[PDB]
Amino acid sequence: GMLETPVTSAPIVATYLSNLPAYRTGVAPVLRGVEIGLAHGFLLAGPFIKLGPLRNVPETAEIAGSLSAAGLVLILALCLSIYGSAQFQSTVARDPLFSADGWSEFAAGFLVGGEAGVAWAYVCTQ
Amino acid sequence: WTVPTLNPDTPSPIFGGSTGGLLRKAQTEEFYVITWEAKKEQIFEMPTGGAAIMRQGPNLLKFGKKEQCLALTTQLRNKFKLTPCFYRVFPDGKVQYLHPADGVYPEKVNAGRVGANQNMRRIGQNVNPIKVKFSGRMMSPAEI
Amino acid sequence: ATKLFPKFSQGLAQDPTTRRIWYGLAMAHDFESHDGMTEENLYQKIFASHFGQLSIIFLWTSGNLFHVAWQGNFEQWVTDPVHIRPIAHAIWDPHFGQPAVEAFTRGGASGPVNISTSGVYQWWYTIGMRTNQDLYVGSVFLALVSAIFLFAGWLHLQPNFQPSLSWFKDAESRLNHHLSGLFGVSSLAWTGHLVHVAIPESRGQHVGWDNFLSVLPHPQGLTPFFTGNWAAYAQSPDTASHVFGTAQGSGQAILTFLGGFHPQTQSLWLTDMAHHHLAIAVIFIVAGHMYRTNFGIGHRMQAILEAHTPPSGSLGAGHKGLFDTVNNSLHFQLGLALASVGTITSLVAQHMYSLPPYAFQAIDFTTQAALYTHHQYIAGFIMCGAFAHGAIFFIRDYDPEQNKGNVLARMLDHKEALISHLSWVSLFLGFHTLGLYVHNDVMQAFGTPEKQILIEPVFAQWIQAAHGKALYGFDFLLSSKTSAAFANGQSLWLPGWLDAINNNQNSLFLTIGPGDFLVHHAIALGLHTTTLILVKGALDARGSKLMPDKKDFGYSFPCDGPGRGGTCDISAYDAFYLAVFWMLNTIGWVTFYWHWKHLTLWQGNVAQFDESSTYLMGWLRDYLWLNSSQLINGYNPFGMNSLSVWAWTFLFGHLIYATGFMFLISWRGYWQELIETLVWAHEKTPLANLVYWKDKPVALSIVQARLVGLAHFSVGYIFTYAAFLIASTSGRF
Amino acid sequence: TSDFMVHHIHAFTIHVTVLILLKGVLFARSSRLIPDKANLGFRFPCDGPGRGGTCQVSAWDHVFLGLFWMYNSL
Amino acid sequence: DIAGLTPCSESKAYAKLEKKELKTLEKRLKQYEADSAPAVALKATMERTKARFANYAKAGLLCGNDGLPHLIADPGLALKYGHAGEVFIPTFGFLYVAGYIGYVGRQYLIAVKGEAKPTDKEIIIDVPLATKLAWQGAGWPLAAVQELQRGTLLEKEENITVSPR
Amino acid sequence: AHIVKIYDTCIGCTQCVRACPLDVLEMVPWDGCKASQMASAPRTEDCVGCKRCETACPTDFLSVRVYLGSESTRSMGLSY
Amino acid sequence: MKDFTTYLSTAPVIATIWFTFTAGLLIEINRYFPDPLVF
Amino acid sequence: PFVPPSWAPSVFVPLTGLVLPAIAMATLFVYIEKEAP
């Protein structure tokens, strides 16, 4: 039926994907959101810091970059919240993340983790 | 003639797989299953792309839409002179026989068929849209 | 499952694809196609929509007034309206760098601002506005009017306030009130404002709400009006040395018909405009007593229509049954209204550039060009809509049984003759205009400019001579000093009109030559071809030989399939669709002609246009290539100036136009197959398949694709020409 | 830098032309939209306004669009 | 004269343009020999330019402020000031040749419509019939007027197909 | 779903049924023509609107008509 | 020879010969009567 | 007087450009995808 290849059938990549927080299937959604948010905010703080309009002025490039990354994390959190509200409206085991309450807790955890990751990336450059 | 029943434990043609197969619609909405009888092992073209080998005897295949099943039916009837039949399967397990609905192909007239959507007039005798205006919804004069 | 949106269509709410949102957005105002819609409910929804539209219009006007009063320089522009550029509003953009900040900081403001090109400064100055307080009060008043209109729209939908269907069909009462009240009384009130405020403010006398009850508009105070000595209001007008806004050289008259223009402002006299509004107010009020409503006297439009059939039967039944097919069809009324409004918009553009009504408007070249182009494009779009609604009327509301033998049925009886003759006129005009152009281009290329065909427009020049222009030397009617028409107006309005028309420095009946003749034929070709497409689409809307039952498929449908040879773009919607391109081309030709003739006029070299408008190479080089040098130099590697926004808008319009060509050339199928591959890619990708779509992704429909491509084409067209026109006219002057 | 940008522009245009031509070759016989495209031939206008619209599904139309993209690239 | 124009024989811009054209031609000729092919060709072009300017001035054409001839399309002005050769006589000349072509084509279609395969005659032109009709088409206005007066020029409304309205 | 209608001008040539790619039409007994058959549309819920049946109809004007109506997963021919 | 004349009587060959004749006539008229603007 | 403060554009332009469209887009997106009972 479907096409099987070593890229999608290797046990190493399957274990790597299963080790990711999104494919844990059994932990609290807020913890998953916190982990994903931290991992995303830490990498997100970089481009705004090194390439923004205030990248050449000293003592404020990191400030502006971190604030921009924080705003982006806030926008992504709002996107996650509206996605959860418009996706789960009615109706192994079923993952609790794919539910209204689960996705709302996931979005809140993502917001907290993203802001913490941005703040940690800002102090890591000092 | 009696309506056939789907046999889920039916061998499928020899195919190595492709990327044009079933999608999430088969697991969440519905899918289609086509079955046929082959007199010998023969290579045919899959409607989703590629070449498969139908085995001698029963053959079962799954498709995402009814058009793929009818295209395969047309290919098997016109080339190998076979008689395939398909069903619509739902995720709950319900099976609905689709074609040939009455056991006889629709191109040839069969007794017992009740005509549907037949207008006992010609096109030029259709009324103007003004007489159909302010109805329940957008209605064409041919619908009355 | 079934979605809530759209609430007006149950079939669209059950659509599981992305087409549901697009179709719900594009069919929101098609109330006739909504679920469970009746005639009474239809009229009530249109009533509420009308009130909402008025609320939006008034709020937009109040916004313009507020921004000019807040971030503008109206108080400084009134002191020197010749050397001071008007300010639209301030600019607050964090993306601006330092050079952009000092580049847009101009006009005497303390920060970056936009120079207005709408001409509201001249209009407000002419009607009486002098300070920012006046604009602030007007803005607050219009905001209150907008809120009142919005509340009226909401109130007329609630029970005990919804009008019945019979009230909406009282054509006689509505026409009487619109002619006498909406037109006549409004014009009379405008005359009262001009006589009471505009005229005294133009003479250096402040007349506001605090002193208009103690200030006389005329020194005789209503006595000549009641005694019939109306000529006393035309005595002692403004002299030729009157300074606008001051009492130096001012007069005492309030109702004159001097004609011509003011020697300083180069605009129409305020007393003449007041007298004009008074005369049309009396005429409209009198016309408002023609129909019979509730007092026995008056007319019934059905009787006048039924009693207007020729005896020989040349028009068949005449206009019998035309009252019912118009009163019961909203598309017929909308088409008539749009046709008249489009023609009036074109009339406004022509009269506004030729006879400037606002003070110091002719000197503002950018304002004149922008206003003319804006009104002509609006008129073209409205005309296309009028014909589109005529086609919609033929499909949805035309009844051959009720309109049996009248003029309406006879139009469809010989529609082939009309379409064939429109085709012949368009073919003749196109072949000859293009042939003369290519001939002149070959003559100019071979170095023989004396061999090109230059037909003098003797008919239009003859009309210009009839109006009083003595340049051509016809010497007849107003051009002859011994004619009865000339001698009968020498004491009322002919001196000023003749002095203004014989002046070659204004836009009042400009001198024309062979180039004007050729471009006028190009305009005729554009009008005839656009009319041919629209008329053919309206007449073939109910059917043709290829699709005998086209009326059973509605006004807009994709096609009838590839059978019978192919039926792409067979609906009337597609006819309007193809006609929009021709409308844009026609308005482009008229605006190109207007801008080039006025650019050569303002630059002081009309010979450039007279010698380069006879061949297309002159149009491409001396008008498009030459006038775009400053535009494309708005931003370059050496820096930028205040004209960089127009350069960015120029490239913006080019990009939108080219993006439209994509929806115009490539069709659905390719995109649908590509989207299917994208669906497979998203479904087979880890860490991303956990996020699924709510609507199934599908390619845009055929009709939607046409609409999207046309919208991009029109937006790019408009933005590109607007940026070029404003940048060239502002940079040159 | 300008040479780098124009080279990437060339690579992008060539890739889009390859995408249209390759899509027209691979999906010439069948696709998820029309499973019997090979029966309709190589040069056919469409398969009707059905399935939302099947305008320009033939391989000929892919060559028709590839010509425009080749013109743009070159 | 008409529309404030001046005759080309008295226009200063007309003579100035003639001098400019002859000047650029002479300037190009100054780089060649005196008995070579480019010299002879340039001299022929100069003579043609002089003859063209003299012929246009002799014809009585009206020149504008640009020094270029202007045509008069009004029949009254053209016949009153001797300008019928610009737009009047060429108008009737085109009408004669155009009606000639249309009449010959119509006669050929009517002649081949009564045969076994008219489409075959439409793709493969019958040269003898076409030549005979082309020669007989000289009296197209008289024949057309006679056909219109007899009622055989037009077809009845009942014999022409129309849409279902 | 699309609206498929059969008219009395049908000659029972069965060309529309053979050209249908989703088995929407069929043949039923009739007495109004020489073929003693008439086209029918009992499975319009599966019609996509390709209009192949109209292309295959030889009567003037057509005896089978397809009016595009509401769109669903089946009418849009979506396999996903 | 009959088939060859029939081939020469086809629409493209006839159009080519006729347009060559008409173009040659116009070119020769403009050659012997250079620059004709008015009658 | 009706004159707005000097800081009015610095507050209204970012509001109308980013806060109001985000709220409007979010509310509209939730309304479009809401399922009927």
Ligand code: CLA
């Ligand atoms: C004297 C009484 C009166 C008055 C003043 C009005 C006034 C109005 N009615 Mg109404 N109506 C009346 C009686 C009246 N009606 C009666 C008795 C009936 C029952 C039979 C109706 C039934 C009725 C209906 C069903 C509707 C209206 C509507 C309207 C509005 C039209 C909107 C518009 O086009 O803008 C105003 C138009 C003008 C001012 C005329 C413009 C003149 C030309 C076109 C322009 C030229 C002017 C100048 C050159 C431009 C200015 C230049 C510069 C200032 C820019 C308008 C405000 C519509 C509505 O509801 O809107 C909410 C509508 O749907 N009326």
Ligand code: CLA
């Ligand atoms: C008094 C004016 C007036 C009125 C009341 C109507 C009213 C109506 N028209 Mg009509 N029309 C008009 C003028 C008018 N029209 C004009 C001037 C044109 C020429 C452009 C048309 C051409 C026209 C056509 C072809 C059709 C209608 C249709 C309709 C009916 C419903 C469609 C609808 O409105 O849904 C909603 C409309 C929309 C959602 C419009 C889409 C958005 C447009 C393309 C604007 C895009 C601008 C763009 C965003 C600018 C961005 C630039 C910037 C970002 C840089 C409705 C009764 C349709 C109909 O009758 O149904 C069968 C029909 O097909 N009209």
Ligand code: CLA
């Ligand atoms: C520059 C582009 C262009 C041109 C030249 C035309 C030209 C024409 N359009 Mg058109 N149109 C265009 C763009 C264009 N359109 C676009 C973008 C759209 C939107 C899709 C439309 C949509 C449109 C519609 C809907 C209609 C037209 C119509 C017409 C015809 C009008 C009649 C006429 O003016 O006679 C003059 C003829 C011409 C200008 C054609 C040029 C003649 C050539 C140059 C002479 C031959 C050259 C030489 C002798 C031989 C060379 C051949 C060589 C291979 C040997 C005309 C042929 C209308 C029509 O058909 O009228 C009956 C019609 O209804 N157009």
Ligand code: CLA
């Ligand atoms: C200038 C007009 C124009 C533009 C912009 C495009 C753009 C595109 N075409 Mg296209 N095309 C055009 C003309 C155009 N085409 C025409 C006239 C035809 C007819 C021959 C075609 C036929 C065609 C085909 C057959 C195909 C495309 C494809 C594509 C896509 C390629 C992917 C890409 O380039 O990535 C990036 C996108 C761009 C570079 C477009 C500009 C995006 C800007 C620079 C980004 C701005 C972002 C900004 C922040 C947005 C904020 C807005 C704000 C209001 C919020 C792309 C979106 C191919 C495709 O499907 O994709 C693989 C495809 O197969 N086109």
Ligand code: CLA
């Ligand atoms: C295609 C449209 C057309 C147009 C727009 C004109 C326009 C004009 N024609 Mg005219 N004409 C036309 C077709 C047209 N013609 C045709 C087809 C013919 C052939 C029958 C004529 C034959 C003709 C003659 C003989 C004369 C004009 C004249 C005129 C000019 C003034 C007379 C007038 O306006 O009444 C419309 C024209 C007519 C009804 C034709 C009869 C002429 C009338 C009776 C006026 C003549 C009286 C007198 C000469 C007026 C000038 C007084 C003074 C200045 C000398 C005017 C610019 C007159 C002119 O100015 O002479 C130089 C003139 O005498 N035309």
Ligand code: CLA
């Ligand atoms: C027997 C030849 C013939 C004749 C008598 C006519 C006559 C007419 N045509 Mg027509 N036409 C013809 C051929 C002909 N056409 C051909 C071959 C074409 C395809 C290009 C067209 C395309 C056409 C259009 C699109 C339109 C007309 C229209 C018209 C009418 C308006 C006048 C006109 O000249 O329009 C212009 C006609 C043309 C520009 C094409 C003329 C082509 C040449 C000159 C004709 C030569 C034919 C043949 C080669 C010569 C006979 C050879 C034979 C002896 C072997 C008129 C009655 C208009 C109409 O509808 O009526 C109101 C109109 O819109 N024609």
Ligand code: CLA
């Ligand atoms: C339709 C008229 C209109 C238009 C086009 C504009 C346009 C603009 N205004 Mg302005 N404004 C208006 C009316 C208008 N205003 C009115 C009537 C007032 C008095 C209350 C103001 C008070 C105002 C202030 C204090 C400021 C602006 C500013 C601005 C600029 C920044 C963008 C912005 O929207 O800020 C915000 C605009 C507002 C908050 C006013 C909106 C208030 C009205 C009553 C609501 C309108 C609702 C609307 C019609 C619904 C449709 C929107 C959407 C749902 C489709 C911009 C050029 C800023 C500026 O100057 O930048 C330099 C700024 O500081 N405006």
Ligand code: CLA
């Ligand atoms: C129409 C409204 C609007 C407004 C007010 C802004 C405002 C801004 N933009 Mg933006 N932009 C807009 C539209 C807008 N944009 C659109 C439509 C596009 C697509 C075409 C873009 C594309 C764009 C890009 C590509 C960039 C900007 C950047 C910027 C910032 C300038 C950086 C700077 O010099 O200051 C200094 C910056 C700071 C001091 C850091 C402040 C960080 C944020 C703004 C504050 C915290 C966020 C806030 C709490 C949450 C807001 C979310 C809200 C919607 C709920 C600035 C705050 C630049 C940027 O983001 O800077 C890195 C930049 O790179 N914009």
Ligand SMILES: CC1=C(/C=C/C(C)=C/C=C\C(C)=C\C=C\C=C(C)\C=C\C=C(C)\C=C\C2=C(C)CCCC2(C)C)C(C)(C)CCC1
């Ligand atoms: C399709 C249709 C339709 C139609 C539409 C239309 C019709 C459009 C158009 C059009 C137009 C848009 C028109 C207009 C017009 C105009 C006119 C018709 C006019 C005129 C004129 C006159 C008469 C004038 C005179 C004079 C002069 C010459 C100058 C001086 C002054 C005087 C006055 C003397 C409708 C919707 C109804 C419905 C049905 C269908």
Ligand code: SF4
């Ligand atoms: S193709 Fe037409 S005539 Fe033939 S069976 Fe079908 S509907 Fe009847």
Ligand SMILES: [Ca+2]
């Ligand atoms: Ca005042």
